[PDB]
Design a protein around this ligand. Structure first.
Ligand SMILES: *[C@@H]1O[C@H](CO)[C@@H](O[C@@H]2O[C@H](CO)[C@@H](O)[C@H](O)[C@H]2NC(C)=O)[C@H](O)[C@H]1NC(C)=O
Ligand SMILES: *[C@@H]1O[C@H](CO)[C@@H](O)[C@H](O)[C@H]1NC(C)=O
Ligand SMILES: *[C@@H]1O[C@H](CO)[C@@H](O)[C@H](O)[C@H]1NC(C)=O
Ligand SMILES: *[C@@H]1O[C@H](CO)[C@@H](O)[C@H](O)[C@H]1NC(C)=O
Ligand SMILES: *[C@@H]1O[C@H](CO)[C@@H](O)[C@H](O)[C@H]1NC(C)=O
Ligand SMILES: *[C@@H]1O[C@H](CO)[C@@H](O)[C@H](O)[C@H]1NC(C)=O
Ligand SMILES: *[C@@H]1O[C@H](CO)[C@@H](O)[C@H](O)[C@H]1NC(C)=O
Ligand SMILES: *[C@@H]1O[C@H](CO)[C@@H](O)[C@H](O)[C@H]1NC(C)=O
Ligand SMILES: *[C@@H]1O[C@H](CO)[C@@H](O)[C@H](O)[C@H]1NC(C)=O
Ligand SMILES: *[C@@H]1O[C@H](CO)[C@@H](O)[C@H](O)[C@H]1NC(C)=O
Lengths: 113, 402, 186
């Protein structure tokens, strides 16, 4: 059984005559997040694509970091719209970045500034 | 001199970034053969250099996407009312119905486009945030005119802004105010025409095609023996001892290294081209969307009035709005006018001929007026100009002098 | 990286050529020698390619710098957001090691004020449009002012020109345009 990349993708077990699937398990690069050794030493580790305070991210599994529900402009980009920072003792937090504030404009058909 | 004027719109496609990639060196060249790694430890710097180059390309891609879009640090918001002087802005504004704020034309545009150490990284700015930026830009360029590109955002009614720009391209305001319904109808019809036209993008797809071809050629290159006895390292090691198999092993190693070198060079060149395109896109975004452009044939063919950015998968799409002349009319003219032995030149315009009378009119739209002293200024006598016509300039003060 | 690459044996028996030649005869040492030669050639090829690409990028940056120098320092630029954020007034080049540094000078607006406005003005059944500016509302009176800095003036015939009647404009306000000639007509 092959694919577009003409590499093995399936196989039939030759005793029970049933279909089996295959998948490699060697993905993932290792990355680390540091708020700067100038201030403190606590760090968090980020894996690239594997599935895993173990918190889960669209771009890997994050360990050593604490999730929050807020949103700010972010300091250290990570991936898939997730950013880490240090403001909080104090620790390392992750969240979804905020593109900025939001102000409506009082646009009326006779008002000028 | 033209007598009628239409309003057209035109698209323009630009790539912004390609697919971020990464290729681990050892996992590709070797499999699980430990001795293969031992041999590669004679070539150590090569893998580090290749990985560094790929990381550089990835960060360059993200930098392009960052530069081209986030031109504003204050996300604006369209008012709930749609009172824009009859301009049916409904095909490019976000719709609350869909989960993402992707507008209709963005949604239509987004659908037309369709193992061994080849991890693919995702961009650190998801498409929803890109659509958010685009919507913010649309709100800013619709309500706040264009001053929001310089400091704060200043509110101003849309009709007055269109009058501003019509003044910009060299026609008086009254032309716009006298034809609001016609202009709005033409604009809406043009928007609908674009909506139809896009319902049936080579520059945005050949990038993906080339990336697929490059990766496919890199993968398929594994099959070849590179002049060795067989492809798989496991078969070679299991059938021969190291003292005679090392030649086959290192020949394969050289083959894989050559393939990686070639692919990396191709990626670097393509990335340089993409960066050039992204810088052009940023310049167009900052000189068309904000303000008005006097650079002829830059922001769409013909005279330029405004623009509307739109997002696209790995791309960006502009909707320029261009004033264009129409049916004209023959006329007779002469530069100077001689009244009392002294010349007369128009302040703004030319001297078209009725065939019986004379007039002064705007340079781009037929508007006959009466030649007064408030439209011309005098300099020198009538004895030096190469061409001139006898006539009389009416004066406003004389009838009031009663 | 180019220098440190010398250390590696490139799959040969040792690094230094002198040791190889002093320990083996040419008929058996030539393979080690030419393997090393291939290694050094590959390293030089890679470094040269990297240098060429970096030089192309630097040339692009230098051409952009020349364009900025000729369009910001000399004259004024209407290309928005080219010579510094905001409106542009002048520039001042400065040198730097292997670089160049500009000091743009940008006019930027400040605190604003709400107002009411209407495009046209109807005086005697005929329209009135400003020559330069807009019609801001005192809340009691009307004025014409510059487009970028509040300067109220009195609406005369020297600030507006007429075209057509009052029966076609989409929005308009009743008012009276003072005339300079009438008081002097005494
Ligand atoms: C190969 O031998 C195995 C031995 O277990 C066979 O497995 C049989 O599977 C059926 C399926 O329900 C059972 O009912 C039998 O009890 C199993 N054993 C035997 C001895 O039949 C298997 O079927 C054999 N392969 C083929 C192709 O028949
Ligand atoms: C960071 O480095 C500066 C360099 O002088 C030093 O003064 C400062 O104390 C350092 N930060 C901390 C938290 O010590
Ligand atoms: C990660 O993979 C495991 C493997 O089955 C799966 O159970 C899990 O749901 C995956 N994680 C997510 C977030 O889908
Ligand atoms: C301006 O908007 C107000 C909203 O209440 C409306 O009553 C008025 O008719 C509008 N005027 C014009 C000229 O559109
Ligand atoms: C100009 O063209 C439009 C449509 O093409 C038409 O309705 C109109 O009568 C023409 N003339 C003028 C003066 O607008
Ligand atoms: C805009 O056009 C769409 C269809 O083209 C229509 O459904 C909608 O009512 C229009 N809105 C306005 C304000 O004209
Ligand atoms: C000149 O213009 C007048 C109106 O101002 C018009 O009545 C007359 O026919 C014109 N002469 C021509 C067209 O020869
Ligand atoms: C214009 O008027 C002057 C005044 O007499 C006359 O001399 C001249 O010939 C006239 N122009 C032409 C073209 O005849
Ligand atoms: C209108 O302007 C005059 C000065 O020209 C001022 O005295 C008056 O208070 C203004 N009306 C207002 C602010 O309602
Ligand atoms: C402006 O004056 C005319 C003259 O009578 C009048 O008919 C018109 O109604 C006035 N405008 C408004 C908005 O009332």
């Amino acid at each position: 059984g092959r694919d577009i990349d003409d590499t093995t993708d399936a196989v039939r077990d030759p005793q029970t005559l049933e279909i089996l699937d295959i998948t490699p398990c060697s993905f993932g690069g290792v990355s680390v997040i540091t708020p700067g050794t100038n201030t403190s030493n606590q760090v968090a580790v980020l894996y690239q694509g594997v599935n895993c305070n173990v918190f889960q991210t669209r771009a890997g599994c994050l360990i050593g970091a604490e999730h929050v529900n807020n949103s700010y402009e972010c300091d250290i980009p990570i991936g898939a719209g997730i950013c880490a920072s240090y403001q909080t003792s104090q620790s390392i937090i992750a969240y979804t970045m905020s593109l900025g504030a939001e102000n409506s404009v009082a646009y009326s058909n006779n008002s000028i500034a | 001199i033209p007598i009628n004027f239409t309003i057209s719109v035109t698209t323009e496609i630009l790539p912004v970034s390609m697919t971020k990639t990464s290729v681990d060196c050892t996992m590709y060249i070797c499999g699980d053969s430990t001795e293969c790694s031992n041999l590669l430890l004679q070539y150590g710097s090569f893998c580090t250099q290749l990985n560094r180059a790929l990381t550089g390309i990835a960060v360059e891609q993200d930098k392009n996407t960052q530069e081209v879009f986030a031109q504003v640090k204050q996300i604006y918001k369209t008012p709930p009312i749609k009172d824009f002087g009859g301009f049916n802005f409904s095909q490019i504004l976000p719709d609350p119905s869909k989960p993402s704020k992707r507008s209709f034309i963005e949604d239509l545009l987004f659908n037309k486009v369709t193992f061994n150490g080849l991890t693919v990284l995702p961009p650190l700015l998801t498409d929803e945030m890109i659509a958010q930026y685009t919507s913010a830009l649309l709100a800013g360029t619709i309500t706040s005119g264009w001053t929001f590109g310089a400091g704060a955002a200043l509110q101003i009614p849309f009709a007055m802004q269109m009058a501003y720009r019509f003044n910009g391209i060299g026609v008086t305001q009254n032309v716009l105010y006298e034809n609001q319904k016609l202009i709005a109808n033409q604009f809406n019809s043009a928007i609908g025409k674009i909506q139809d036209s896009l319902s049936s993008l080579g520059k945005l797809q050949d990038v993906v095609n080339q990336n697929a071809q490059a990766l496919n050629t890199l993968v398929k290159q594994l099959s070849s023996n590179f002049g060795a006895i067989s492809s798989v390292l496991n078969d070679i090691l299991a059938r021969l001892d190291p003292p005679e198999a090392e030649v086959q092993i290192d020949r394969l190693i050289t083959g894989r290294l050559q393939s990686l070198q070639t692919y990396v060079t191709q990626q670097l060149i393509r990335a340089a081209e993409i960066r050039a395109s992204a810088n052009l896109a940023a310049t167009k975004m900052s000189e068309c969307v904000l303000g008005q452009s006097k650079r002829v044939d830059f922001c769409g063919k013909g005279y330029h009035l405004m623009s509307f950015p739109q997002s696209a998968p790995h791309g960006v799409v502009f909707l320029h709005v261009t004033y264009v002349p129409a049916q004209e009319k023959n006329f007779t003219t002469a530069p100077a006018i001689c009244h009392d032995g002294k010349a007369h030149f128009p302040r703004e315009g030319v001297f078209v001929s009725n065939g019986t009378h004379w007039f002064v009119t705007q340079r781009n739209f037929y508007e006959p007026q009466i030649i007064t002293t408030h439209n011309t200024f005098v300099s020198g006598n009538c004895d030096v100009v190469i061409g001139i016509v006898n006539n009389t300039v009416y004066d406003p003060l004389q009838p009031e002098l009663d």
